[PDB]
Amino acid sequence: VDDYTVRVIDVFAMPQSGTGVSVEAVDPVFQAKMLDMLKQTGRPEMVVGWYHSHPGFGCWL
């Protein structure tokens, strides 16, 4: 929305893959089709970021 705020409205899971949480976990076909089909419903939002679960250990990268 502006420089001092990043608003996230919806989050859609990407399929679990043997790669893990890596650039290759973002199946381009799945992401493209998901965004295309969500646009029709009324959610024409952009990809603002990504999320991944850190079981056990805390929030770090």
Partner: peptide
Amino acid sequence: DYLENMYGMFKKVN
């Protein structure tokens, strides 16, 4: 088709 594709996506997810 939209319903079936959404269901397929969600089946892939869970």
